[PDB]
Design a protein around this ligand. Structure first.
Ligand SMILES: [Mg+2]
Ligand SMILES: [Mg+2]
Ligand SMILES: [Mg+2]
Ligand SMILES: [Mg+2]
Ligand SMILES: [Mg+2]
Ligand SMILES: [Mg+2]
Ligand SMILES: [Mg+2]
Ligand SMILES: [Mg+2]
Ligand SMILES: [Mg+2]
Ligand SMILES: [Mg+2]
Ligand SMILES: [Mg+2]
Ligand SMILES: [Mg+2]
Ligand SMILES: [Mg+2]
Ligand SMILES: [Mg+2]
Ligand SMILES: [Mg+2]
Ligand SMILES: [Mg+2]
Ligand SMILES: [Mg+2]
Ligand SMILES: [Mg+2]
Ligand SMILES: [Mg+2]
Ligand SMILES: [Mg+2]
Ligand SMILES: [Mg+2]
Ligand SMILES: [Mg+2]
Ligand SMILES: [Mg+2]
Ligand SMILES: [Mg+2]
Ligand SMILES: [Mg+2]
Ligand SMILES: [Mg+2]
Ligand SMILES: [Mg+2]
Ligand SMILES: [Mg+2]
Ligand SMILES: [Mg+2]
Ligand SMILES: [Mg+2]
Ligand SMILES: [Mg+2]
Ligand SMILES: [Mg+2]
Ligand SMILES: [Mg+2]
Ligand SMILES: [Mg+2]
Ligand SMILES: [Mg+2]
Ligand SMILES: [Mg+2]
Ligand SMILES: [Mg+2]
Ligand SMILES: [Mg+2]
Ligand SMILES: [Mg+2]
Ligand SMILES: [Mg+2]
Ligand SMILES: [Mg+2]
Ligand SMILES: [Mg+2]
Ligand SMILES: [Mg+2]
Ligand SMILES: [Mg+2]
Ligand SMILES: [Mg+2]
Ligand SMILES: [Mg+2]
Ligand SMILES: [Mg+2]
Ligand SMILES: [Mg+2]
Lengths: 54, 122, 17
RNA sequence: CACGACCUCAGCUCAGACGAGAAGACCCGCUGAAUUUAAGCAUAUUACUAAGCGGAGGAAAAGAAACCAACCGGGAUUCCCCCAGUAGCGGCGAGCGAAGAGGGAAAAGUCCAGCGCCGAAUCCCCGCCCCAGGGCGAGGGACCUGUGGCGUACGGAGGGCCGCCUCUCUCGGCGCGGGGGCCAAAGUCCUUCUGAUGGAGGCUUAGCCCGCGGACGGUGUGAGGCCGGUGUCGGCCCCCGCCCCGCCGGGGUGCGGUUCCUCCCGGAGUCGGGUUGUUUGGGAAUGCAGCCCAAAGCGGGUGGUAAACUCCAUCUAAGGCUAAAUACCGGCACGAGACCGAUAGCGGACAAGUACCGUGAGGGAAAGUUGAAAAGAACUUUGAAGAGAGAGUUCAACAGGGCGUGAAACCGUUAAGAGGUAAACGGGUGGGGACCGCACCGUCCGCCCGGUGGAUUCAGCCCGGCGGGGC
RNA sequence: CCGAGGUCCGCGGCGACGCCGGCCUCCCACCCGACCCGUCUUGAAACACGGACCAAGGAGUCCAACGCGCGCGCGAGUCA
RNA sequence: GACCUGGGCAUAGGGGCGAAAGACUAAUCGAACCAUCUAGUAGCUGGUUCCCUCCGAAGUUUCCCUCAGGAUAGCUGGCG
RNA sequence: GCUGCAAGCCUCGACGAGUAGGAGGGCCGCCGCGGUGGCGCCGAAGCCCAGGGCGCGGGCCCGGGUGGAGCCGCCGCGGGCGCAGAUCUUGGUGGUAGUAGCAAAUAUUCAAACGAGAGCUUUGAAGGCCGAAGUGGAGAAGGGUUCCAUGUGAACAGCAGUUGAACAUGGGUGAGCCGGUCCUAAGGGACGGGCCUACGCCGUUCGGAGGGGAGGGCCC
RNA sequence: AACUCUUAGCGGUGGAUCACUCGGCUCGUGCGUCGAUGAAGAACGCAGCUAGCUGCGAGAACUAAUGUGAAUUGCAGGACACACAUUGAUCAUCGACCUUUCGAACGCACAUUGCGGCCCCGGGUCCAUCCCGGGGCCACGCCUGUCUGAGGGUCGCC
């Protein structure tokens, strides 16, 4: 599904803290907050070159 | 070979509508073959099992020629309970062991006005 | 429950002569 | 309003109806960006896209030519292939980009205003009578500032002439698919194994039996024959629908041919022109819109270069309707997969848009598995109790409750060895250890040969039958 | 036989899981060698950066179009 | 006294408000927060996963709002 | 005699470094499909090993243990196909480490009861602090059962607990005269009208034919 | 002795791997239906023992009807269920019936279970006032018609 991986709103924290400069989920009180969201290396993220149906 | 395309043949769909089947469908799923003496008298292949039927376990650990009598038909677990097919618990109280209806064979039918009507259509 | 990581929350340093 | 008519405009919790919100995948009308590209950037591009606003339907929109073409001419719209990355647009840079023809899917055409004949011949409401379909009332209105019939660019109408039963529509009664129920083939045969067989072997080698049924699934393991089903346009029953035909019953009204006569023949602040903004491949305008100018009736539009004259071709603008081919990441109900297999696949295989965070808009998880069956551990015993030791259940407790399998990091313990120049590593050998391998004549294996000693349904040769080879 | 690369028609001690065999892996000892990988860089063992450890996931893809080479079918045809 | 303070109200993001510090506007202000366009762009850092065999470089020319990059020639490999 | 898998076998000679990069070979490895050849409760996949071996290598085969239901060879085909790095993502675990630390507002002490268990609970006595701008007694906002009684001591209360704002089982808020309700203050916001292509917005005592109560028997 | 390191067995920690799959994803097909006759959504409530989810609405874990024909299940237990023969357990279908409050939300408003009006009915009052209870109603825009009107706006007749 083309919506897989992009169901989240995540902005990289950037330079200034010991994180790895990767799009991280918005703040909250869950375990999901602060985790990698978009990259193919991230758990629950988008896959590299999603298999298109065409 | 299933020539019909409206009836599903799927490992996933045939298993969902089996464990989630309504009670009136679970009655026909919990069928049991008739004895070779009754199968030639009523000329019926098999019948859905009832409460007051005398069956005989054919397969499993409790198999043998001991003709018992069904105690209850646990429609939810697709299992029945026979009067002599039981097991002693730790304290000593006997617990009835569930047997699938496809492993028993009916030797005496609980004939009612509706049970005999089904025997006519077959 | 808590997030995996949280946002953490000045020498001028110019030698002259 | 002295008494009325009318015009215009009000009031109501007046009689009866209608609109609102939702959804929004597809569809219609507006509005509208910037990231991005041009290796900068301002036009361009991104894009007549995202977001924003309004309005619908099962499709919407479009649609019966003010068309294409320039030909021996095609003939509503929509869709696909092609035309075609073409004509063309563009700091003619980056880039953008249609259409006629042709081949296909589907095809269905039509109604008003105007023109003016018909005694408003028309319509709604109210009170009713008869069997969805037809009438009545000296009831109340609408309407002449125009209802209805004929009639619309294919010409139309009326009157002479000629030839010609005229049949649709709505109800009752026949012979002509779909939906929902129920049933319908055959091993639990013999032997064996297993905790359980659905395993193996057999049943004259017809592999026993069925088969138009050997799809799938369930059942304690790999089941055509145990079971639900599968195959049979099988059989039966209860509802309902469709076209045509037939007679009966209520309402429909005749139609054509006329190189014959006469009459009638059309959509204004619209076309067009100027200008401005926007849009387009449309380029001295492709569409749309504002302001100004503002028409004609052998007129008007178009003929892809602005302009005048002329010829030719083509259509008739400024009113309305219309199915089918077409689209469909929403919804209802289904089938399928060279896909994913619990850090994967939807965020969600689980009391998932849940717990939880934020004032709010919003953000948003982790989390599947005892066993075939709880048979979920009786009872004894130590402890305040968790927690132990016996016993017991199960094929298994190396399945004891987040309980299948149980890796690595890390740690405890046991066994072995070593340790002053951090530990490991490469090359060479030695010591030790843990597990393994190896005559009993395994250099007396095999071909031939020469003697010794027990046996040869005993050999060459011959007869008969069979079979095979032979550019 | 100083001849197209070797044979013995020579031989000895041991042979019951032990007194024999394994040298790769395990532990230990010694001699020689031996600085930590990845990466950018003229130059990294660097007082250059990333890396405490382990498991799982993790990065050249698909579509349109173009070029050349090769396989195949037919051939002034070819592709429906 | 230009005082302190609660509640109810008002001003909303290129906007507010400011006895003026670019202060304050929910721990965020030389332009808040939330979602989307968006997987924005990066000539710039980082990483880019199995083995063996064979061949094997270049930092030079010319042009460029180029000089951390390209195009082009050279050097290389592959198919012949 | 032996081979002739000719994509095979045999003979001879020379040669061998290598980052960036290019190419070839793979009977190297993973998942799935079409063929084909099998294996499995007399024990499959996975996992572990001081066991026996093969290949230059990628890796592979066998044995033992564990496990309990599926799996693999070859000829072709299709990929979400091989990790030590990315201050990589998620999960887990170490050294530091029985370490830092449990140091703001003067104070505890003796005996007894309950209890398996007492510096910490309860009772009594002694000695102290808050010292009426309190460590006192009651409310507003806010919280939402935290209130009260009994029971338990698993988790939590950063030592403990016989205790609790924890857990479990029950119970508890009674109004004509307390407040809301009623009034309009700031202000919000309909109506008329205007505006906006629109959803809507402007505006608030002004602006429309905006008067539906009171009286005299039909007037006002 | 200890301590440190290495190797193996066993036991912890941890959860990988493998096998399993009522889930997802993708494609195709048939339909293609909401709402003032009160929708979507939301609130509250409903089970003998019930928190959540699901199902329902004071008839609340379902009623009637039809098909089906003996169960529901955790423990209860009790069925106007069962020897259906006092025409029926359950399930399915679903043409009857029912469907609280907010919500386009509609008397006016809502951080209020606040504040009203009209008509009718029953009771208290019995002297029709007042009080309580029940039912039917009262939003905005617009269409047709009725009724009641307004303006020398244009006229007619006196
Ligand atoms: Mg996103
Ligand atoms: Mg750091
Ligand atoms: Mg995902
Ligand atoms: Mg609407
Ligand atoms: Mg640019
Ligand atoms: Mg750039
Ligand atoms: Mg939009
Ligand atoms: Mg259609
Ligand atoms: Mg239409
Ligand atoms: Mg045409
Ligand atoms: Mg071309
Ligand atoms: Mg364009
Ligand atoms: Mg099967
Ligand atoms: Mg059968
Ligand atoms: Mg443009
Ligand atoms: Mg139309
Ligand atoms: Mg759809
Ligand atoms: Mg998941
Ligand atoms: Mg979903
Ligand atoms: Mg289970
Ligand atoms: Mg386990
Ligand atoms: Mg580097
Ligand atoms: Mg650099
Ligand atoms: Mg240095
Ligand atoms: Mg570091
Ligand atoms: Mg991995
Ligand atoms: Mg090229
Ligand atoms: Mg204040
Ligand atoms: Mg402003
Ligand atoms: Mg100030
Ligand atoms: Mg300054
Ligand atoms: Mg200030
Ligand atoms: Mg080499
Ligand atoms: Mg895959
Ligand atoms: Mg990958
Ligand atoms: Mg790793
Ligand atoms: Mg202190
Ligand atoms: Mg004080
Ligand atoms: Mg309570
Ligand atoms: Mg208390
Ligand atoms: Mg107590
Ligand atoms: Mg404590
Ligand atoms: Mg208490
Ligand atoms: Mg509590
Ligand atoms: Mg050592
Ligand atoms: Mg180790
Ligand atoms: Mg272990
Ligand atoms: Mg309602």
């Amino acid at each position: 599904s083309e919506l897989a991986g992009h169901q989240t709103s995540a902005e990289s924290w950037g330079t200034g803290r010991a994180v790895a400069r990767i799009p991280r989920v918005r703040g909250g009180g869950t375990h999901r907050s602060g985790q990698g969201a978009f990259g193919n290396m991230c758990r629950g993220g988008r896959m590299f070159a999603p298999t298109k149906t065409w | 070979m299933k020539l019909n395309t409206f009836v599903t043949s799927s490992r996933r769909k045939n298993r969902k509508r089996h464990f989630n089947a309504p009670s009136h469908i679970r009655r026909k799923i919990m069928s049991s073959p008739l004895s070779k003496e009754l199968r030639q008298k009523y000329n019926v292949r098999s019948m859905p099992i009832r409460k007051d039927d005398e069956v005989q376990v054919v397969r499993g650990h409790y198999k043998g020629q001991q003709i018992g009598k069904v105690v209850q038909v646990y429609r939810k677990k697709y299992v029945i309970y026979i009067e002599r097919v039981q097991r002693e618990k730790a304290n000593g109280t006997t617990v009835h062991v569930g047997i699938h209806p496809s492993k028993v064979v009916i030797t005496r039918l609980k004939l009612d006005k509706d049970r005999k009507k089904i025997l006519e259509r077959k | 429950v808590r997030p995996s990581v949280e946002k953490p929350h000045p020498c001028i340093q110019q030698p002259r002569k």
